Symmetry: D2
Amino acid sequence: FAPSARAAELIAAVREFIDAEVMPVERAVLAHHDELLGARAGTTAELWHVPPELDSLKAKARAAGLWNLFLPDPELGGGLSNSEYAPLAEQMGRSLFAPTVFNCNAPDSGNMEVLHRYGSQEQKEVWLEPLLEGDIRSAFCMTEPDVASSDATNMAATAVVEGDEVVINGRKWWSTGVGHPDCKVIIFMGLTDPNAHRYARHSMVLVPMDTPGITVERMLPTMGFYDEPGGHGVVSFDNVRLPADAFIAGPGKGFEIAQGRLGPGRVHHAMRLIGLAEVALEHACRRGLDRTAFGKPLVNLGGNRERIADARIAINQTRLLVLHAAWLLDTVGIMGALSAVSEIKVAAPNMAQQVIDMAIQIHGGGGLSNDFPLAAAWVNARALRLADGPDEVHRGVVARIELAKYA
Amino acid sequence: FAPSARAAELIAAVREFIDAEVMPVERAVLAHHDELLGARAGTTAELWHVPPELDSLKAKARAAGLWNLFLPDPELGGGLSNSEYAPLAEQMGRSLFAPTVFNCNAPDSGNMEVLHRYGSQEQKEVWLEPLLEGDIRSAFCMTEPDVASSDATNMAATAVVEGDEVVINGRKWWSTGVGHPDCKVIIFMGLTDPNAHRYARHSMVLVPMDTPGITVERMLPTMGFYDEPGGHGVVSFDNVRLPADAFIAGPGKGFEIAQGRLGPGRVHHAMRLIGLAEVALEHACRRGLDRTAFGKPLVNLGGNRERIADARIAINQTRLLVLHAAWLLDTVGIMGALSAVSEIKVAAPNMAQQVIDMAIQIHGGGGLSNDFPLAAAWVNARALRLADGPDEVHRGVVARIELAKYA
Amino acid sequence: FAPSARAAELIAAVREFIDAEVMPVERAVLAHHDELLGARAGTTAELWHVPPELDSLKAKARAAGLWNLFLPDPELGGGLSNSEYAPLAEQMGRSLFAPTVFNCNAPDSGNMEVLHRYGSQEQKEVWLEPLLEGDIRSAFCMTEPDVASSDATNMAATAVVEGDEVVINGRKWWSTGVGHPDCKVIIFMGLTDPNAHRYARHSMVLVPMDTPGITVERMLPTMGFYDEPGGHGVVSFDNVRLPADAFIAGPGKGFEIAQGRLGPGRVHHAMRLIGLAEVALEHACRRGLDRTAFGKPLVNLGGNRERIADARIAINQTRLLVLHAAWLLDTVGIMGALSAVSEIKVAAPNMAQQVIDMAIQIHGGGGLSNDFPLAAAWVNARALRLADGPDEVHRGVVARIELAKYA
Amino acid sequence: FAPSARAAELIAAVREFIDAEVMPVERAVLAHHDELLGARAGTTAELWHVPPELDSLKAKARAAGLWNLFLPDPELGGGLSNSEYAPLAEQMGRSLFAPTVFNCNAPDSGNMEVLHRYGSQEQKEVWLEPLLEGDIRSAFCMTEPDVASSDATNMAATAVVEGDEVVINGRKWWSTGVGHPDCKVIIFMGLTDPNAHRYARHSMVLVPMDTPGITVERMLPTMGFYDEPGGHGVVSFDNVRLPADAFIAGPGKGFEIAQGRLGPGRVHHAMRLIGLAEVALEHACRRGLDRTAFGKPLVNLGGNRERIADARIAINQTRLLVLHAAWLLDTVGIMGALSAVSEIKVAAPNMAQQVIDMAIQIHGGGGLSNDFPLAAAWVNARALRLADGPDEVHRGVVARIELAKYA
Ligand SMILES: Cc1cc2nc3c(=O)[nH]c(=O)nc-3n(C[C@H](O)[C@H](O)[C@H](O)COP(=O)(O)OP(=O)(O)OC[C@H]3O[C@@H](n4cnc5c(N)ncnc54)[C@H](O)[C@@H]3O)c2cc1C
Ligand SMILES: Cc1cc2nc3c(=O)[nH]c(=O)nc-3n(C[C@H](O)[C@H](O)[C@H](O)COP(=O)(O)OP(=O)(O)OC[C@H]3O[C@@H](n4cnc5c(N)ncnc54)[C@H](O)[C@@H]3O)c2cc1C
Ligand SMILES: Cc1cc2nc3c(=O)[nH]c(=O)nc-3n(C[C@H](O)[C@H](O)[C@H](O)COP(=O)(O)OP(=O)(O)OC[C@H]3O[C@@H](n4cnc5c(N)ncnc54)[C@H](O)[C@@H]3O)c2cc1C
Ligand SMILES: Cc1cc2nc3c(=O)[nH]c(=O)nc-3n(C[C@H](O)[C@H](O)[C@H](O)COP(=O)(O)OP(=O)(O)OC[C@H]3O[C@@H](n4cnc5c(N)ncnc54)[C@H](O)[C@@H]3O)c2cc1C
């Protein structure tokens, strides 16, 4: 239940950095965005500018040793176990920009993990190194608009071998980060040989964004939020051709890569949602103590204290479920954590959604505005019931594993 | 349980008009908005243009006799009872623009009701007539950002008599519609004499928007949605002075006006939410039958049919609770419907929120986008747990009335 | 929304009779049962004695014209439409004994309906007449312990034609009422010819309880409650042989009988649950106003008023869903109410369970005792999520019918 | 997250003993109880006989070193930390008799803790020693029927000093265990001096059950269950007089004793509920895999796998919340676990209630019977939302502590 000496030091360092360095910039960026739209002024394009202060924050973070903390390689990353990194991800979850500032954000962290493990020497030199430096961004392109992508076997976009080339065709969407000016490379997942054995029909391909035949068609909203500057895009691939060396690991290894990498990412997202919920609960308590109606602080009205209690309980038990999952990954590996990594995927976004909805209510109309981070937070938690696989698919995993115990 | 001959005719006429005339325009407007933002193109200001097709739709509606259907006055409105109008409001709730097209939208419908009942002959000639014609828009300004406005007694913005003038000072927000270019008049609610008897301390004032000292400070988002072209604004009043004839009814009558008008508005909103939920359920069923994953239509997976059943039940029982409320208003009046008009205010938005969240989930990632109306619908239902008084305040009314039975 | 003159008269008469005549006896019977068990005294067998006061209450009810009110035949019953009887069933739901006192209790009401519609002249003379007089009781034997009886096609108990006899074998359980000393006849449902067309494989048989080969094996608890004096039994049939005239309608007509009778029964049960919930809410309000803790009446603590409000809303909307179902049965018949009769089956017991659980909580420890009717009420509502088909099966019906609209 | 070597050994030993030794007896006892009542046979009094096999099981447990495992004193108990004992309590929670067999049952464990810490040398020799040996039982008498005892300051039963005696008057109820033939002593909590300082107005008194003026008035049901042989009683005290040495610690120390003992008991109950929920989930999975309807195992129908997943998640996160609470008690003591010990009190019974209700449903009608332990389990979890203080009071504690962080 207690963290290592290193973890305790880093929790304090990360939280201090976020509150002192990141949050003033974060508040300023969000306020300026709100001011422009509130004034019905300016261009749409200017809302997508990368905040200049981010590179300055990244540099400061690097100088403080707060960089690549997600990556367990001690030479290239922070060397942290899952149990050590978990509480750091919670702290980063309290801030929109924090994961980026520490180079720990999705999808880049997951893509770096894929390249570190499965990339060729050249792929690592050309693409992993600039990602590790924070000099470029990437995206992971798996979901397809025209098929129900919650079942990966439905993928119809293709990456096929023709002579010494890989040839890529299709359309992907919800690609996080592709709107960013420095998103220079894509990991494309698609169908290769439908007649191969099950589990060997798909591939991942490393695709530079400047390859002819790629089009970022449009950016997508989540309840009206565009998540600038990286956004979530639609990407089409029309006769995109690369050297066959562009495959990651090789043709047919798509499923193996996904399974091989599974676990840490689920912990990272789930821990960020704990942080998000804490920020929401904190806002709820402050607002509810400060505002008065019907002769009382709002918190003292009706069921509000019961709601606060329920949120405290919910956060705490979910946090512990996630920390336990990290401990399993550290001790028994993914083979001993297969249920846990789906349990936390269901639990965390659902818990956060309910805490945040309670916090919004306590703020009245203002809760739905962007004068507070709650409205954006709600959408974030809601989206995480779908991103990386819907709740229902993960419940299916948990049920299957439970029922297998009775055979 | 059955409607009048007139109501049956109008249900068919309104639904036909919405599907044939309104929805093609509605889809085009929403698509164009989405296309501009998706392309990261254009100005923010152009998103606020009033769709030119609305005046054409309003004219067609008027020509068909589908106009002012909310208003029970048979000369100036449709002459409909609450029971007759209720199912029409449900049909209008299926469409973003429909209430405007039939001149039945909030806040204008409520403001017209106030002026019809309490307006002087001159107020009715100058302001009610253009509202009834659909030539201008209005807003209702009661909520104040710096106080918890769920308790109306907290109002600190003032409308005070000084000689032959009324003098208005303060700040209001969440004023629906004030962004519209044709929003020409405001009904301001504020504190007049704090030392008067309880219930006689507040007033409503008819305030032309071009009066010196009024500033629309900014427009407000609800989860990133701005609800163009009318929006939701912040309005400040700095030494705004009008002839004392600008009071509606007279100084101190604010609470009396509010209580006197109570009932129909609650039915209108609650019925629109039934329509909104039906549209969401319909989308869920279509999508769930058409999309396939894990060997099955999505609807056939896991608990999805149970979710569909629960939504059907929820919509149906809530609809009937609202229709019953309309029947009470028609037979025993507001004095016999005091609990019912708060019951429906709690029930309808909570029911719709849950149906819509279920529908979004079934759509996968696309459910959160504006390729479908579900994301906007969710925010609409969520907001209606706060607009016109939070859930909690209305539960308080219902509880008080129930407990009074045991005295 | 308003009832007929007859219905209004009967609502008042039934409620008056229940409160003045039935409830003093009901309270005395329950108190005596509680006193014996609380004292760890007496025999188990004496708890099953039929309260002598019931025949006196039945006679008084008959004399007042409050008899067979469920049965629409105006000669043999009350002549009431479903809409007229519905509010009477609500009033009866407020009392454990009331349905019996008015001869409107399940399973006898359903069995009388079957015999009235499908019985031969002789079956009606021998068995329907004494049931209509309240002189005997009956039971309906369909559910089988060794198969999942929620799917009627699983029935393995048999009723087969051999020459001029019907031969019955198998085991049934949860047979309501078979413990009663005057339970003289059973309607047995079983498999007849598995090779017949679908829907023509099952039969209902009228089986006198004194037929050789019938054994009432044991009585069953529902959370420790035995529901004396009728209880819920296990009944075995070993080479039970009757004249082939004992079939109701004829061999193979089991499904037709069930479908033909469907609707009114669902309304009766659902309306009784509305009454049950009202009694629970009333207890909650009285107790919560009278008891004081932490300086306040219990109702004024925490979320209790919100809970009271939610119960009022839940009861009211569910009531209206059921009254609407009765109206459909009266106007369009079962063919136009197929979804509604399953909607109410899901809605009513789930609503009542939650209201009752809230009421129990407000009573503290005493809520779980039989010093109040709440504990027994909870079990009643809980059981009605299973009796006459589980929630899930009924959700399946509702979903199927909804989805069929989009074909 | 891992247990000590001792804890791992004892988890295996306790679980093995329960499954091999306790459960055959437990099943036989419950079956015999069910058989008698099902046959409408025998006396009520015979249902209260102490199963003879318990003393044999206690002796075997003692011989195996599985005795007084709750008590941290290494001479008199097992010497276990809270973290070590917690998983043992979970295993005991799987069985009705297990806590008694290991001498770890409430209320005796809590009473032993009180005497160990606060008892005089003589009180420990006369009463603690026979309790530690399992030779007698005890009860804790605090709750009073005529006042809302959720607020301890409402206590109106008195224990007052008159000369060299303590004089006790009043009525207590829900006293667990007082029906047992070997319940020889009571810890009475009552009002002593209402004019003393807050927190010094109440006392605990050690009261032999054979003292003149004590009457066990009646035993109480929880949904029809009497929890033989100890039950839950009503106890009246009429001019009960004892030497003033009968006070535990001294007059006025009632609140101090309660606060001083707080923590371990909450962990014990919460861990037992985890075990109870696991037994329910296990039953649900077995039944759902074995029974078939509509062409499928029941588990494969509708939302049942989602329900199984949700139960697995709920159990797991709640377990971890409780284990964390035990770790806090071991490291920072009750002063650092004040919120946690109320969080687990809310969380565990609510979690178990929902898992059990799901399990009952999957069993169909049989789920409500005592052919399985689920019906009794439901009542146990439900009761634990009230026993040792209602959910609402504990939510109040959690909220207060959370809100204090923002001062
Ligand atoms: C914020 C956000 C960021 C994203 N980022 C990325 C990204 O970076 N890269 C990327 O490739 N994708 C991304 N996605 C896409 C996301 O992973 C998919 O939306 C998700 O996997 C569901 O796929 P789908 O949208 O095709 O939905 P579909 O598969 O069409 O529908 C899924 C729905 O079907 C139902 N369903 C499916 N299986 C079951 C079951 N077993 N039981 C019951 N119901 C079931 C559920 O209602 C489920 O929600 C992102 C999505 C969001 C919202
Ligand atoms: C879409 C939208 C449109 C709107 N349009 C208009 C408009 O046109 N004109 C206008 O004047 N206003 C408008 N409003 C404002 C709206 O009516 C207010 O936001 C609402 O009345 C709450 O007031 P508040 O925002 O000051 O919240 P506060 O009063 O600060 O906080 C309210 C919260 O306090 C708590 N609370 C309050 N009372 C109780 C209680 N009895 N028990 C328990 N908890 C309680 C609840 O959490 C409640 O949600 C609009 C709001 C929205 C979202
Ligand atoms: C108080 C009471 C009185 C009763 N009275 C009578 C009586 O008088 N006469 C009589 O014949 N019977 C009676 N019954 C029996 C009752 O009708 C059955 O218990 C019920 O139909 C379920 O059948 P089963 O018990 O065999 O459960 P099973 O069929 O073994 O299990 C049913 C469970 O399976 C699951 N399930 C089934 N279908 C689906 C689906 N489509 N989707 C998801 N899950 C599903 C659900 O968990 C459901 O609860 C009574 C029961 C009770 C509790
Ligand atoms: C199985 C069982 C075993 C028991 N064993 C014992 C025993 O061994 N010894 C013993 O002394 N007692 C025992 N009890 C009694 C138990 O501790 C009390 O029932 C409980 O403390 C509640 O007290 P009360 O019954 O007087 O309820 P009351 O105080 O009359 O009512 C309590 C209810 O009031 C409401 N309420 C109270 N406070 C709040 C708040 N802050 N916010 C909102 N609502 C609130 C809630 O609805 C709460 O449930 C047992 C009870 C049960 C069910």
